[PDB]
Design a protein around this nucleic acid. Structure first.
Lengths: 37, 205, 167, 122
RNA sequence: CCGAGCGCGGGAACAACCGAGACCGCCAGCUAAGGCCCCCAAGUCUGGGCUAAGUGGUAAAGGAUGUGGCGCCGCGAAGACAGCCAGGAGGUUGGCUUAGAAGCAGCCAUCCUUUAAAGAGUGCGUAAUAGCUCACUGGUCGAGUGGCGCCGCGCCGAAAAUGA
RNA sequence: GGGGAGGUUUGGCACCUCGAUGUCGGCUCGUCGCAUCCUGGGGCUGAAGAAGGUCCCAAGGGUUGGGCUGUUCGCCCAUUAA
RNA sequence: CGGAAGGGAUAACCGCUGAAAGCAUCUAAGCGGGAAGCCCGCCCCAAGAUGAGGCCUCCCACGGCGUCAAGCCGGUAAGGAC
């Protein structure tokens, strides 16, 4: 579900990071990949 | 790296293997080495090559007869090849062995006034239907009020003809030492005695 | 730290040891220097970027030392089938699903080793070149995917249903 | 030299005798056609007693140019018209009886079943 | 206010956004708007914090272990947090429905027990069991730790047609 | 249910233009914007390989003829990397 | 006959060592890779690039006033224009 102005966590694999710019959303299943666009 | 001077002779479709091939012969001719060039004392990578000798009276002046080795002045000048530097000897033909592609810079037939349909390629107009006013013309140019300017670098009507251009990749077929004729593929502009030279091609990798 | 030969230089701490000679470009912003058995590591205050560079400094330099302390364990294994891997000549020659053989030549800071062409090991000294080049091996081939074939340093395969899913 | 109107002929047994090229089934904006291109021609006339009928869109293998195609071996060859056969929507011609010669043009396309039937080669 | 002040100084350039009724001269100093890095006149002034994007060059609903400062609550040198060994139980497979529904699809739903400690069970897992699990708890261990409410600045949310 | 963006469409304003601004669509000549059709790429999969669904980056180039369409929305065949 | 090929940095993105916080983390210090895209490489223009740059060589005082200041004045050189 990449890219959207809001970004959130469902499970405890999901987390937030800063790098080279905007917000980034991760998880173990990378099916939970996002960005703040 | 490599190169040689030349004049265009022929173009025929000789039968190599069993094939009709466009063959331009290039009389590279006696091209003596003269003024050698280096970055420090001059600027860049170059040597000077004199296409063919035929000027005693009608030329005068320093003569690269002073240069170090005489050799007099050619029928038409010696030239500084981009990327080239030999030993001290006359380059002609046998430096190019059978089976190599080379770049080839030509100076070619001028034309003068040239139209668009044979400069670019537009659609002229109706040879009937609409106005017979327009017949052969490019039509529109730029936009209305905005932008409004005919754009800089635009494709318009004027001159097309004698241009200095290097062509890329053509096999060297054969070579003749006794009279000095290099035999290659089929193109070369200029007159059937116009001006053209070989460089070393920039092939694969 | 017995067989160490210490030295502290500007933004880069020079160290020598039994395996190789190296340094880690840290930072001349806190002060460290040769002493006792080890070296004193002190930051001049309690900033946050500080402490970042505190654990950083400590590690960094310790990682320089881990190489000289015989830390040449650079591990590789290849779980698959037709995944031959040879120590021919001096370097890597291996097929992992591809038809064209994969060749890899070793830079300075490493030595080579191939026991049985189904698992491979490099023996070198730089935690940077360790993971950069080794993950470059995991880049020589992408792992698992649905079942299990490819290169894993020592990683693991997770299954994603093959007998259906895509319909 | 064929285009989406170039009336062309056949030399087969099957049915049709005349069609009209639609496309060239290649580089779609090429349209020009010599001995080798592929016209999806629309059928125009056939024999009132048999299979394959007037006005069905068909794919088609091309032969016989009227401006000689430039041969590799030095030469140049052409026939007395502009014509050939159909290809069907599962490859090959729906034909079986050639009338007159062909060229090795077709041979260079690698379709032999046509060429074995070919009486004279050029 | 302009019109009647597109007279003057600012606003880069813009009658009415601000300053000021011009009678004329002045190589006289004051001074309003705004200004001192410059063209352009004026402090690379003096000083203590804040910001890390070029925010300032100009956007939001909403979203965030970006940073400083205030403040609330407990675990904790009886030893916390965090990483480790260890149980992580039994009636219970709770009831029920249901092809079966075992903490776990679900709805109704609160008992206690061997205790240091286990929740009618947190997510995962099976066809439903089995199973990884975590809460619980003891240690190992060594000095802090995790959550909430608050005030500033930055971050994203942010894609157009000539060249900026 | 919220809010925003962009100014291709149809409307609102009537403010330059009624002391002549001459029009759809078609030909002609282009140039641009990327919220991107195709080719590049990458992560995701309710992605076996073959193919597809989604978002993001990415213009350097490319994008057919035709019959009834006069024609605003055509339709279809034949293609095509589109 | 050719686009490419190759390099350099980089995006979306894939990773290393790495703490702040004894766990994590591609990022906070640094490193790897990464597009037909950016620049070069590749072909054209090109010294009014008022920067007129660089190079081979040719010729050569006063030959006559301006007593200083800058020039002027004709036959010439090397050459050139018709």
């Amino acid at each position: 579900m990449k890219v959207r102005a809001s970004v959130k966590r469902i499970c405890d694999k999901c987390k937030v990071i800063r790098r080279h710019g905007r917000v980034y959303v991760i998880c173990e299943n990378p099916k939970h990949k996002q960005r703040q666009g | 790296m490599k190169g040689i001077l030349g004049v265009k002779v022929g173009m025929t479709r000789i039968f190599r293997d069993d094939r009709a091939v466009p063959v331009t012969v290039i009389l590279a001719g006696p091209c003596p080495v003269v003024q050698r060039r280096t970055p420090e004392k001059d600027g860049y990578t170059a040597v000077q090559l004199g296409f063919l000798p035929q000027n005693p009276k009608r030329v005068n002046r320093p003569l690269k007869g002073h240069f170090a080795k005489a050799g007099v002045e050619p029928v038409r000048i010696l030239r500084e090849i981009r990327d080239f530097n030999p030993e001290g000897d006359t380059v002609t033909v046998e430096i190019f062995k059978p089976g190599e592609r080379v770049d080839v810079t030509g100076t070619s037939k001028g034309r003068g006034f040239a139209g668009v349909m044979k400069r670019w390629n537009f659609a002229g107009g109706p040879d009937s239907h609409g106005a017979h006013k327009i017949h052969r013309h490019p039509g529109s140019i730029g936009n209305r009020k905005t932008p409004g300017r005919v754009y800089k670098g635009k494709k318009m009507a004027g001159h097309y003809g004698a241009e200095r251009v290097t062509v890329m990749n053509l096999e060297v077929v054969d070579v003749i030492p006794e009279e000095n004729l290099l035999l290659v593929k089929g193109a070369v502009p200029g007159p059937n005695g116009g001006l053209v030279i070989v460089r070393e091609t920039k092939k694969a990798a | 730290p017995k067989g160490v030969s210490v030295e502290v230089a500007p933004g880069r701490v020079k160290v020598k040891g039994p395996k190789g000679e190296l340094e880690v470009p840290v930072s001349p912003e806190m002060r460290v220097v040769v002493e006792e058995g080890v070296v004193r590591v002190e930051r001049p205050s309690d900033e946050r970027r500080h402490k970042s560079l505190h654990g950083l400094t400590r590690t960094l330099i310790a990682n320089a030392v881990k190489g000289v302390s015989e830390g040449y364990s650079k591990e590789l294994l290849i779980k698959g089938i037709g995944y031959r891997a040879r120590l021919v000549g001096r370097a890597l020659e291996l097929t992992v699903g591809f038809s064209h053989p994969v060749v890899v030549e070793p830079p300075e800071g490493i030595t080579f080793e191939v026991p049985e062409p189904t698992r491979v090991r490099v023996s070198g000294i730089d935690k940077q070149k360790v993971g950069q080049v080794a993950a470059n091996i995991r880049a020589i081939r992408k792992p698992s995917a649905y079942h299990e074939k490819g290169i894993y340093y020592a990683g693991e395969p997770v299954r994603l249903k093959p007998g259906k899913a895509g319909a | 030299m064929i285009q989406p109107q170039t009336y062309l002929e056949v030399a087969d047994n099957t049915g049709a005798r005349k069609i009209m090229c639609i496309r060239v089934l290649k580089g779609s904006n090429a349209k020009y056609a010599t001995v080798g291109d592929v016209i999806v021609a629309s059928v125009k006339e056939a024999i009132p007693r048999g299979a394959v009928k007037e006005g069905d869109v068909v794919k088609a293998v091309v032969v016989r140019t009227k401006k000689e195609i430039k041969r590799p071996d030095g030469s140049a060859i052409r026939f007395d018209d502009n014509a050939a056969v159909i290809i069907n929507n599962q490859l090959e011609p729906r034909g079986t009886r050639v009338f007159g010669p062909v060229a090795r043009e077709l041979r260079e396309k690698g379709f032999m079943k046509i060429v074995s039937l070919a009486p004279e080669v050029l």
